[PDB]
Amino acid sequence: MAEEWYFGKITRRESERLLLNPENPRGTFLVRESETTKGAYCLSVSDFDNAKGLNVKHYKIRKLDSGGFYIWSRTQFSSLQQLVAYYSKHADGLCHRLTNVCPT
């Protein structure tokens, strides 16, 4: 479907390398396949910590039978685009709203 924020089959280390770029504003993000569980995905986002510096938080996106995806079971979605659209307007669990697509 070609969404710029979707990187697919990249490792976690690859996702942190892209997100830990110093030019990324807080809330920069991407969605990728889980590097550990077949069928699962992940939302990786950038944030800053005074003591340690730039950091990346990873959220496991579970994919149901069934269709559907969710970070927390109380807020579910029919697709990955719907999930990103939502969190792009409401943190609702996240430390911050998804602010910017991570540059490829």
């Binding site: 992940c42 938080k57 990873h58 959220y59 496991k60 970070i71 927390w72 669990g93």
Partner: peptide, 7 residues
Amino acid sequence: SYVNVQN
């Protein structure tokens, strides 16, 4: 290491 997964 995922924020939403305790275990």
